[PDB]
């Protein structure tokens, strides 16, 4: 499965989770920014690797990263 | 005491992966709350590749320049 | 005479055997 | 019902749509004929070897014994060899 | 259900004010360029009317007048062909 | 009026005016001084 | 002469080219009444041809075996009109254009919306600045010495 | 504390004539997915695969081929209509795995019972160079 990571530059705007089309990401509590929340990728086995989350991140540089990795039926988006 | 540079001061971005690396920007507000890992808010003259013109940086990633 | 033996040998028999064998190795499951 | 966690083959459409399931329309004696005669070819590994070596040697045979009346390549050139642009 | 002539008077004011505001039709493009990509979008979206507004009546009015513009250009082009036929042609000798 | 001068200052229009002037100039120069592989006046 | 070439004034092939060109245009000329306008046009092309070859012969161009001018760009002082002199003219004009454009960009860079004047030209400012290019070599040399030409630590 | 609602079969499915966009052999031998939702009425909705179907008043059950189809349809149900949805993964053994909303809370809303996964506590530019993890199985972002 593709690897997905979050970096502590995250400001907790929730846009990566809102963008994700397979529900890979969540918002968890954290004390490092004002929004008091940081993203997380607990379901990367469903990650298809489209990088909509990365398109959604406002941090410079990104705080989500999708490292495309070992392919599976789920990561290739196959309905067959 | 106030932490970080004065608001309105010009700072040089030291974050190597920043679009504005080795450039300058203006300080907006420095979040005085500790445990905030990147408290300095900088606005820039030019948008980056994500059409964003502001970003937060750590205290050791900004260098006040006059 | 010899080309009439070895041209079909390496142009027909050898590719058929190699393709079938590689097919088996590639489809195997351990 | 079309959704049942007990039977997913029905739930996921795992059916034999055109499978007859009827008994043999082939009468016997015909069946025993082909069962005894095609039996040596029902071992898949053995059949593979018989086909590769049998067909390979067959090919080698019709290739080695081909006649110029069939292949121009065995017949060879029948004309006086021409002359190159400047050379032979 | 009684077919009839229907128009509205003076919907859009004839002015050069929006001639001077590039991308006036788009709320994003009208803000002007931060990057060169702006310049391309201004031209790719210029005739995409149903992206400028969601009101079918405005879109239909733009379409109609645009067709007039096209026909004007076609008549100017035919004027060119006949004029060149009269002034710069060998059509009588032919 | 002010808006029209503004429109005439916009990139494509200023470009057509500028290059049209440049083209007329270069055409007339090649009309009075045609051919010319060299700067003959030394 | 240089590079084994011969002056075009001394080249048989060059004169053969002028001859064949002129006779070609005259072959076209035989088709039209001499008072007609096509005739006058072909005569004008003929006079322009003679002017062309006569000028190339005069100004000292060397010819190849092809009967065509070849340019000597080595710097040999007999042929500065073929490159070095038009080259200095070019560098003057190009330096003018670039220096003026740079002057404009510096002039609008501290405006409230700089891009606004990049897509809609401030023609008064441009007219003010165009003639700075006349003295661009002195201006750019003085800037190079003063340290205003190059941005610091870039 | 949250208890996932169990998948109730015999839940009705939307009114639909069938399409070539539905399940294949993958659902029989590998896995498929099921999305359930509560509707206030009978509505027309666009199917993520075929054309148009009629959402039934009350509980709706819909078997889809991929998780992304469930999440797409659910996104639309929550957007165009105002409908709560859940969906599950279903294996050919009959086993069911509740998937979404995992907490009973949508994942874009921070919920305190959630544990960090794949979170690296550093700027992205502080990842090491590949040479420093060479011949080790690790990747510089796995740290
Ligand atoms: C490796 C270079 C090489 C190349 C490119 C060729 C190319 C060719 N050979 Mg030749 N051949 C070679 C080496 C080579 N040969 C050697 C070393 C020998 C032994 C002295 C032969 C003896 C030979 C005979 C008797 C004949 C050909 C023939 C031919 C032509 C038809 C192909 C064929 O019949 O299969 C080639 C047949 C072989 C026996 C080649 C195998 C010889 C060695 C052991 C190669 C190693 C093969 C190995 C198992 C796989 C390695 C893959 C590859 C790198 C070689 C063809 C143009 C036929 C011909 O002339 O048709 C008009 C023909 O009758 N070859
Ligand atoms: C040829 C077909 C065609 C037609 C009929 C239209 C029609 C229209 N366009 Mg479009 N356009 C076209 C081609 C066309 N355009 C092309 C090829 C491009 C480049 C991709 C554009 C890009 C474009 C943009 C960016 C915009 C439009 C807009 C418009 C609308 C403005 C109407 C208006 O105010 O009229 C104009 C009134 C006139 C009297 C026209 C005369 C203008 C002349 C040409 C002045 C220029 C003279 C200049 C000085 C050259 C002389 C120098 C000399 C040396 C030759 C209109 C419906 C605008 C709009 O609002 O969108 C809805 C708008 O913003 N168009
Ligand atoms: C491929 C190597 C090479 C190079 C680099 C040169 C270079 C040169 N050759 Mg040579 N040549 C070569 C090969 C070469 N040659 C070979 C192989 C042969 C044998 C065929 C020749 C034979 C040959 C001959 C016979 C002669 C030359 C001459 C020259 C010089 C002519 C230009 C000049 O006079 O100064 C430059 C002229 C100027 C007017 C300078 C003004 C231009 C200004 C500086 C530029 C303008 C920029 C702008 C306005 C200001 C900048 C501002 C800034 C501060 C920002 C020149 C330095 C001639 C010579 O020696 O000249 C005296 C000459 O006699 N060449
Ligand atoms: C009467 C027929 C007609 C009409 C009214 C439309 C109308 C429209 N089309 Mg369509 N279309 C047509 C025919 C038509 N099209 C044809 C024949 C094709 C096949 C190519 C297409 C393929 C097509 C595509 C793929 C798209 C559209 C799009 C659009 C919309 C945006 C137009 C725009 O602003 O672009 C602005 C116009 C330009 C930027 C001009 C571009 C300059 C061209 C590419 C070069 C022309 C070369 C020139 C003739 C020769 C060289 C001259 C040069 C050297 C000076 C618009 C509503 C776009 C859309 O988004 O839809 C909403 C879109 O993506 N159309
Ligand atoms: C017999 C009546 C009549 C005639 C002849 C036309 C003719 C035309 N119509 Mg129209 N139209 C009519 C009635 C008519 N219409 C009605 C009843 C409706 C529904 C209410 C429409 C609505 C309609 C739309 C929405 C559009 C057209 C368009 C067109 C043009 C299509 C392109 C073409 O073929 O160019 C060929 C060119 C010619 C034949 C040159 C002659 C054109 C003359 C000058 C016009 C004659 C008819 C005109 C309506 C008379 C009214 C003038 C008066 C009110 C001052 C064309 C000229 C398109 C358009 O507007 O293009 C600009 C278009 O978008 N028509
Ligand atoms: C699509 C239509 C079309 C096309 C492609 C052409 C193409 C051409 N025309 Mg023609 N013309 C047209 C329409 C057209 N014309 C029409 C409708 C008329 C009036 C009935 C004329 C009258 C006309 C005349 C009198 C002449 C031409 C000439 C020419 C040729 C040279 C163009 C030129 O003047 O150089 C460059 C153009 C300019 C320097 C000025 C162009 C800008 C003008 C003033 C319009 C811009 C102002 C506008 C209102 C905004 C050229 C091949 C010339 C020719 O044939 O040469 C022998 C010439 O003598 N045309
Ligand atoms: C970098 C490529 C290149 C270069 C070096 C040249 C160079 C030249 N070309 Mg060519 N040409 C090119 C590409 C190029 N061309 C291309 C791409 C095309 C196709 C569009 C042509 C088509 C073409 C034609 C049809 C003709 C030329 C001609 C000429 C000569 C004209 C000189 C002149 O205008 O008098 C001197 C001009 C000036 C001094 C102007 C500068 C003064 C400024 C404006 C003011 C200065 C104030 C102080 C010149 C040596 C003409 C020629 O006669 O060739 C011998 C000619 O007939 N060119
Ligand atoms: C890292 C890689 C680096 C590579 C470096 C490569 C370098 C290649 C060479 C570069 C420089 C080449 C110079 C060539 C000079 C040619 C002129 C020449 O040698 O002849 C010398 C030329 C000859 O000039 C010729 O003479 C002929 C008669 O013999 C005719 O008159 C020709 O028309 C005339 O051009 O005379 C000069 O004018 C040169 C001197 C000018 C004044 C120089 C001193 C000024 C001091 C300040
Ligand atoms: C010199 C001409 C001049 O300065 O024009 C100055 C004028 C006005 O100048 C324009 O004014 C606008 C506001 O009205 C804006 O300030 C523009 O930025 C400015 O360019 O420009 C023109 O309209 C002339 C364009 C064509 C000039 C050549 C005509 C032939
Ligand atoms: C002489 C001669 C020759 C030679 C030459 C050479 C060899 C040269 C060299 C040259 C060089 C080696 C040069 C250099 C350069 C460097 C640098 C470093 C640069 C710079 C520039 C700049 C800086 C610019 C600026 C500007 C201006 C001034 C104007 C416009 C704007 C701008 C900004 C662009 C030949 C034989 C060919 C020919 C004959 C003559
Ligand atoms: S790459 Fe796509 S599927 Fe994977 S986490 Fe990002 S948005 Fe979700
Ligand atoms: S887009 Fe970036 S800043 Fe926003 S929640 Fe996702 S990781 Fe955090």
UniProtKB/TrEMBL annotation, chain B:
Subcellular location: Plastid, Chloroplast thylakoid membrane
SUPFAM superfamilies cross-referenced by the UniProt entry: Electron transport accessory proteins (SSF50090)
Protein topology in the membrane: Peripheral membrane protein
TM ranges: none
The keyword Membrane is annotated on this UniProt entry: yes
Gene Ontology CC terms: chloroplast thylakoid membrane; photosystem I reaction center
Keywords of the record: Membrane, Photosynthesis, Photosystem I
Lineage: superkingdom: Eukaryota
GO biological process: photosynthesis
Similarity-based family: Belongs to the PsaE family.
PANTHER family per record: PHOTOSYSTEM I REACTION CENTER SUBUNIT IV A, CHLOROPLASTIC-RELATED (PTHR34549)
Role: Stabilizes the interaction between PsaC and the PSI core, assists the docking of the ferredoxin to PSI and interacts with ferredoxin-NADP oxidoreductase.
Name the record gives this protein: Photosystem I reaction center subunit IV
Automatic annotation (TrEMBL), chain D:
Top-rank taxon, per record: Eukaryota
Name of the protein: Photosystem I reaction center subunit VI
InterPro entries per record: PSI_PsaH
GO process terms (BP): photosynthesis
The protein's role, per its UniProt record: Docking of the LHC I antenna complex to the core complex.
Keywords from the UniProt entry: Chloroplast, Membrane, Photosynthesis, Photosystem I, Plastid, Thylakoid, Transit peptide, Transmembrane, Transmembrane helix
Predominant subcellular localization, coarse grouping: plastid
Membrane topology note: Single-pass membrane protein
Pfam families documented for this protein: PSI_PsaH (PF03244)
Subcellular location: Plastid, Chloroplast thylakoid membrane
Similarity comment text for this entry: Belongs to the psaH family.
A GO CC annotation given for this chain: chloroplast thylakoid membrane
Species of provenance: Pisum sativum (Garden pea)
UniProtKB/TrEMBL annotation, chain F:
Alphabetized UniProt keyword annotations: Chloroplast, Membrane, Photosynthesis, Photosystem I, Plastid, Thylakoid, Transmembrane, Transmembrane helix
Family listed: Belongs to the PsaJ family.
Keyword Transmembrane helix: yes
Species this chain originates from: Pisum sativum
Function: May help in the organization of the PsaE and PsaF subunits.
UniProt GO BP: photosynthesis
Pfam family of the protein (one): PSI_PsaJ
UniProt-listed HAMAP family: PSI_PsaJ
Keyword Cell membrane recorded: no
Transmembrane segments: 6-27
Protein name as annotated: Photosystem I reaction center subunit IX
Automatic annotation (TrEMBL), chain G:
Disulfide bond entries: 8-63
Localization terms from the record: Plastid, Chloroplast thylakoid lumen
Keyword Glycosyltransferase: no
UniProt keyword terms in alphabetical order: Chloroplast, Membrane, Photosynthesis, Photosystem I, Plastid, Thylakoid, Transmembrane, Transmembrane helix
Residues annotated to bind chlorophyll a 1: 74
Binding sites annotated in the UniProt record for chlorophyll a 3: 74, 77
Binding-site list for chlorophyll a 4: 74, 77
Transmembrane segments: 83-107
GO biological process: photosynthesis
Domain of life: Eukaryota
Binding site for chlorophyll a 5: 77
InterPro entries to which the protein is assigned, alphabetical: PSI_PsaF, PSI_PsaF_sf
Binding site for chlorophyll a 2: 74
Main location (coarse class): plastid
GO cellular component entries: chloroplast thylakoid lumen; chloroplast thylakoid membrane; photosystem I reaction center
Alphabetized SUPFAM superfamilies for the sequence: Subunit III of photosystem I reaction centre, PsaF (SSF81536)
The family this protein is said to belong to: Belongs to the PsaF family.
Role: Participates in efficiency of electron transfer from plastocyanin to P700 (or cytochrome c553 in algae and cyanobacteria). This plastocyanin-docking protein contributes to the specific association of plastocyanin to PSI.
PANTHER family: PHOTOSYSTEM I REACTION CENTER SUBUNIT III, CHLOROPLASTIC
Protein name: Photosystem I reaction center subunit III
Species in which this protein is naturally found: Pisum sativum
């Amino acid at each position: 499965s593709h690897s997905v990571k979050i970096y502590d530059t995250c400001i907790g705007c929730t846009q990566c989770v809102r963008a994700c089309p397979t529900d890979v990401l969540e918002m968890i509590p954290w004390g490092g920014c004002k929004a008091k929340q940081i993203a997380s990728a607990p379901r990367t086995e469903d990650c298809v690797g489209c990088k909509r989350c990365e398109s959604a991140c406002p941090t410079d540089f990104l705080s989500v990263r999708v490292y495309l990795w070992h392919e599976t039926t789920r990561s290739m988006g196959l309905a067959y | 005491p106030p932490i970080g540079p004065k608001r309105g001061a010009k700072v040089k971005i030291l974050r190597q992966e920043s679009y504005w690396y080795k450039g300058t920007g203006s300080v907006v507000a420095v979040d005085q709350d500790p445990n905030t890992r990147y408290p300095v808010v900088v606005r820039f003259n030019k948008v980056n590749y994500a059409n964003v013109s502001t970003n937060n940086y750590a205290l050791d990633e900004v260098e006040e320049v006059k | 005479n010899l080309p009439s033996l070895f041209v079909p040998l390496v142009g027909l028999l050898f590719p058929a055997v190699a393709m079938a064998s590689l097919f088996l190795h590639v489809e195997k499951r351990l | 019902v079309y959704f049942d966690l007990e039977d997913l083959g029905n739930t996921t459409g795992q059916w034999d749509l055109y499978g007859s399931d009827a008994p043999s329309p082939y009468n016997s004696l015909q069946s025993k004929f082909f069962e005894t005669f095609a039996a040596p070819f029902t071992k898949r590994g053995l059949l593979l070897k018989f086909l590769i070596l049998g067909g390979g040697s067959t090919l080698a045979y019709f290739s080695a014994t081909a006649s110029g009346d069939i292949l121009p390549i065995k017949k060879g050139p029948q004309l006086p060899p021409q002359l190159g642009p400047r050379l032979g | 259900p009684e077919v009839k002539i229907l128009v509205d008077r003076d919907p859009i004011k004839t002015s050069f004010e929006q001639w001077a505001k590039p991308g006036h039709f788009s709320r994003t493009i009208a803000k002007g360029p931060d990057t060169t990509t702006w310049i391309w979008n201004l031209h790719a979206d210029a005739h995409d009317f149903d992206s400028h507004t969601s009101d079918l009546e405005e879109i239909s009015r733009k379409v109609f007048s645009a067709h007039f513009g096209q026909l004007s250009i076609i008549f100017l082009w035919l004027s060119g062909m006949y004029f060149h036929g009269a002034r710069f042609s060998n059509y009588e000798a032919w | 009026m002010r808006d029209l001068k503004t429109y005439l200052s916009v990139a494509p229009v200023a470009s057509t005016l500028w290059f049209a002037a440049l083209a007329g100039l270069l055409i007339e120069i090649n009309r009075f001084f045609p051919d010319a592989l060299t700067f003959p006046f030394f | 002469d240089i590079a084994g070439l011969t002056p075009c004034k001394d080249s048989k092939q060059f004169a053969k080219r002028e001859k064949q060109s002129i006779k070609k245009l005259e072959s076209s000329l035989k088709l039209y009444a001499p008072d007609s306008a096509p005739a006058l046009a072909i005569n004008a092309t003929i006079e322009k041809t003679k002017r062309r070859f006569d000028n190339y012969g005069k100004q000292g161009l060397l010819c190849g075996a092809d009967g065509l001018p070849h340019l000597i760009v080595s710097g040999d002082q007999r042929h500065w009109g073929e490159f070095i002199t038009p080259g200095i003219l070019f560098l003057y004009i190009a330096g003018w254009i670039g220096w003026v454009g740079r002057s404009y960009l510096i002039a609008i860079r501290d405006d409230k919306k700089p891009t606004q004047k990049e897509i809609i030209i401030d023609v008064p400012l441009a007219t003010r600045l165009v003639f700075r290019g006349f003295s661009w070599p002195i201006a750019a040399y003085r800037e190079l010495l003063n340290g205003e030409l190059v941005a610091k630590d870039v | 504390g949250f208890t996932p609602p169990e998948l109730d079969p015999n839940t009705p499915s939307p009114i639909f004539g069938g399409s070539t966009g539905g399940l294949l052999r993958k659902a029989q031998v590998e896995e498929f997915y099921v999305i359930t939702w509560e509707s206030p009425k009978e509505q027309i909705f666009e199917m993520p695969t075929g054309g148009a179907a009629i959402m039934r008043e009350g509980p709706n059950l819909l078997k889809l081929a991929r998780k992304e189809q469930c999440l797409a349809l659910g996104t639309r149900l929550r957007s165009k209509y105002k409908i709560k949805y859940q969906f599950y993964r279903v294996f050919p053994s009959g086993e069911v795995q509740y998937l979404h909303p995992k907490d009973g809370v949508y994942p874009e809303k921070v919920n305190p019972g959630r544990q960090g996964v794949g979170v690296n506590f550093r700027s992205i530019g502080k990842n090491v160079s590949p040479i420093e993890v060479k011949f080790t199985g690790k990747q510089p972002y796995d740290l």
